[PDB]
Each structure stands twice: as structure tokens, then as C-alpha cells.
């Protein structure tokens, strides 16, 4: 007699019992693999006497979990909400993912784990470090603060801050490291020789306290006119009063700050400490002029040896200042 051959292998199905051949009368059963369903309902067949399995209308397709394209305030990386695909989630900035970051479409046709949700990241109101007060804070959400919000602290009078004065509301619901408010004092500043110094009239001096200096006519300051009590208990700087220099020569064109000037004119009232200048002097041989420097260093200034000061009443030898450059 005849016999039916092995059954055609249908997509996403299972046949039972699956033999390579059947006797007329035997029965087999197609079933969609788990995670699939059929536009039909599980087809069974009995091997005909002809030995030819009938036409199979069985079509199995993936069960489809519920639409999950939208994630309020977030992104949903997906392909097709059908078994056994995986879909992942994430939230826009400001929000955190309250739930699993991904989920699969189970063979049952539901999402596992249950779809997550994006939620607003928040920090509770911040604390005030000792000896400080924050003047930059206002709840953005209820009694609390939202992501990347800020609060700014300013220490208390006579107290120095250590660490940024500004804190932000991090993704961890907590704020960034807080600043410190220690109290700092500075010793009184020493008066400068040939000069004087001033500062608040009180028992002790603390952080951010100002002290000003100066010098008697003959001298000038070699440091800033004003200084303050730094957070490290010492001062901005300690200026001294340095002696000015009398004009080195009677008449001469010199370079002061890259420009030519009449030295007797520029420093009519003497040169201050530090003032630098450049003298001109020719190079006999090549008949051109070059320049060397000099500077007022506390009452003294070394005019270059190469310099030659021609007298006003002589003039008859051209000045180095007027010789072509070298």
C-alpha cells in the first residue's frame, strides 16, 4: 500500500508525532511554536489512502505584546512589539527611569518586566553649612529642587569659604559637595620704611579686611596700594616704599615702553622705582645706533656706558638717538 511521507516543515510550527512516513489512517498535529499563534487554530491531518498529505493552511505568527512606542518623557528603542523581541527604555534629561531599562515580549504575549516609567529627578532642599547662609535657592518642584538646579552659599562675616560657593542638584537626588565657612584672622600689616600703612581700628583683623599703603614723596610702592586678609590668614601682599631715581642725564631721547620719549620730559619729576628705559648710542664702525637698557632700582640707575650725552651747546655732533638703526 501507499504511505504519507514526512510532513512539510511549516514556519514556527511543530508536528506530532513526527515520523519520516505514515500509514494511511495515522494522524499528525501541527501546532505553532510557543510565542506564536495561527490564523487557524492548530491543524490536524490524517494520512490519506492516496499517500498525499492535504494542503496546509496553517500560518503561525508571533504573538504581539501591547503597543509600547511611547514612553512619556523618554525614548523607546524598538523594532516590533511582537514575540520575542526586546524593547529598551531611557528618559530625557531631568528624568530618571523608574523601572527596568528593557523588556521582552514573552511567549505569553505580555511585557516582562512590566513597562517602566520616566520620573522627574529631584533633590530635597539643601542644608546650610555652619557659619553660612544661602541666598540663591527656590524650590522648583513642590518643596523640592529639580535636576541641575543650583544653590549658592556665602559664608558669614569674618569667615572664609572653602570649596565652590555653588551646589547643583545631581542625578542622585543629592547635592554636590558643600562649602566650608571657617573664621580667619590676619596679623596687622607692618608699616613700610619711607612710607605708611592703614587698616581698620579694631582688636583683630579678619578675612577680606583691607589695608592700604603709601610712600613719602621721595619713594613709591613696589607692590599694590591695597591689600586684604586672605583666607589663609596672611595678606594679599606686603608692598615696600622704594626710592625713586633722579634723572640720570641732562638731556636724552630714550625708549620708554617701546616708544621714544625725551627722558628729561617723561620723568621730569624723577623716575619711579622699577621704571625701565633704553638709551641710544652709535656703533662708530657701521655708523648706526643700537640701544641698551637701564632701570631705576631703589634710587639707583645705571646709564649704559655706551651712552654718550652730547651737550645742548655743542650740537654739532649728531646724537646717537638720531643715527639710523643698526
Ligand X SMILES: *[C@H]1O[C@H](CO)[C@@H](O[C@H]2O[C@H](CO)[C@@H](O)[C@H](O)[C@H]2NC(C)=O)[C@H](O)[C@H]1NC(C)=O
Ligand Y SMILES: *[C@@H]1O[C@H](CO)[C@@H](O[C@@H]2O[C@H](CO)[C@@H](O[C@@H]3O[C@H](CO)[C@@H](O)[C@H](O)[C@@H]3O)[C@H](O)[C@H]2NC(C)=O)[C@H](O)[C@H]1NC(C)=O
Ligand Z SMILES: *[C@@H]1O[C@H](CO)[C@@H](O[C@H]2O[C@H](CO)[C@@H](O[C@@H]3O[C@H](CO[C@@H]4O[C@H](CO)[C@@H](O)[C@H](O)[C@@H]4O)[C@@H](O)[C@H](O[C@@H]4O[C@H](CO)[C@@H](O)[C@H](O)[C@@H]4O)[C@@H]3O)[C@H](O)[C@H]2NC(C)=O)[C@H](O)[C@H]1NC(C)=O
Residues that bind ligand Y (CB under 6 A): 232, 234, 237
| Binding partner of 171, given ligand Z, ligand X, ligand NAG, none, CB within 5-8 angstroms per partner class | none
166 binds ligand NAG (CB under 6 A): yes
Size of the site for ligand NAG (CB under 6 A): 2
Q: What is the DSSP string of 96-158?
A: EEES-SEEEE-TTSSEES---EEEE-EEPPPP--TTEEEEE---SBTTBEETT-EEEEEE-TT
Q: Which is nearer to ligand Z, 163 or 270 (by Cβ)?
A: 163
CB of 297 to ligand Y, least distance (A): 22
Q: Which is nearer to ligand NAG, 88 or 150 (by Cβ)?
A: 150
Q: Are 74 and 90 in contact (CB under 8 A)?
A: yes
Q: How far apart are CA 23 and CA 45, in angstroms?
A: 12
- If you ran DSSP here, which 8-state letter would residue 71 be given? B
Q: How far apart are CA 296 and CA 277, in angstroms?
A: 9
Site residues (CB under 6 A) for ligand X? 142-143
Q: Which is nearer to ligand X, 142 or 325 (by Cβ)?
A: 142
Of the residues 80, 164, 234, 269, which one makes contact with ligand NAG according to CB under 6 A: 164
CA atoms within 13 A on the CB side of 293: 9
| Binding partner of 143, given ligand X, ligand Z, ligand Y, none, CB within 5-8 angstroms per partner class | ligand X
Q: Which residues, 158 to 177, sit near ligand Z by CB under 6 A? A: 172, 174, 176-177
Q: Which is nearer to ligand Z, 179 or 239 (by Cβ)?
A: 179
Q: Are 236 and 230 in contact (CB under 8 A)?
A: yes
Instruction: Find the residue with minimal CB distance to ligand NAG.
Output: 164
Q: How far apart are CA 189 and CA 196, in angstroms?
A: 10
CB of 172 to ligand Z, least distance (A): 4
CA atoms within 13 A on the CB side of 197: 20
List interacting residues with ligand Z (CB under 6 A).
Answer: 172, 174, 176-177
Binding site for ligand NAG (CB under 6 A): 164, 166
Amino acid at each position: 500500500g501507499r504511505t504519507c511521507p514526512k510532513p512539510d516543515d511549516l514556519p514556527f510550527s511543530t508536528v506530532v508525532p513526527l515520523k519520516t512516513f505514515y500509514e494511511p489512517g495515522e494522524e499528525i498535529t501541527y501546532s505553532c511554536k510557543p510565542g506564536y499563534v495561527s490564523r487557524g487554530g492548530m491543524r490536524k491531518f490524517i494520512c490519506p489512502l492516496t499517500g498525499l498529505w492535504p494542503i496546509n493552511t496553517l500560518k503561525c505568527t508571533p504573538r504581539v505584546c501591547p503597543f509600547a512606542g511611547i514612553l512619556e518623557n523618554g525614548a523607546v528603542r524598538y523594532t516590533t512589539f511582537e514575540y520575542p523581541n526586546t524593547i529598551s527604555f531611557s528618559c530625557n534629561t531631568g528624568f530618571y527611569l523608574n523601572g527596568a531599562d528593557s523588556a521582552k515580549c514573552t511567549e505569553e504575549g505580555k511585557w516582562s518586566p512590566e513597562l517602566p516609567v520616566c520620573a522627574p529627578i529631584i533633590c530635597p532642599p539643601p542644608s546650610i553649612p555652619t557659619f553660612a547662609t544661602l541666598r540663591v535657592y527656590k524650590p522648583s518642584a513642590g518643596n523640592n529642587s529639580l535636576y541641575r538646579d543650583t544653590a549658592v552659599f556665602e559664608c558669614l562675616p569674618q569667615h572664609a569659604m572653602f570649596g565652590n560657593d555653588t551646589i547643583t542638584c545631581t542625578t542622585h537626588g543629592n547635592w554636590t559637595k558643600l562649602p566650608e565657612c571657617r573664621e580667619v584672622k590676619c596679623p596687622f600689616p607692618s608699616r613700610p620704611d619711607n612710607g605708611f600703612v592703614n587698616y581698620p581700628a579694631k582688636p583683630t583683623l579678619y578675612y577680606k579686611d583691607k589695608a592700604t599703603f603709601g610712600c613719602h614723596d621721595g619713594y613709591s610702592l613696589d607692590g599694590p596700594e591695597e591689600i586684604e586678609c586672605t583666607k589663609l590668614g596672611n595678606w594679599s601682599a606686603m608692598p615696600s616704599c622704594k626710592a625713586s631715581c633722579k634723572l640720570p642725564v641732562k638731556k636724552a631721547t630714550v625708549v620708554y615702553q617701546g616708544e621714544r620719549v625725551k627722558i628729561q620730559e617723561k620723568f621730569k619729576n624723577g623716575m619711579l622705582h622699577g621704571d625701565k628705559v633704553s638709551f641710544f648710542c652709535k656703533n662708530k664702525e657701521k655708523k648706526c645706533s643700537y640701544t641698551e637698557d637701564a632701570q631705576c632700582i631703589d634710587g639707583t640707575i645705571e646709564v649704559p656706558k655706551c651712552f654718550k650725552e652730547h651737550s645742548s651747546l655743542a650740537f654739532w655732533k649728531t646724537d646717537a638717538s638720531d643715527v639710523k638703526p643698526c
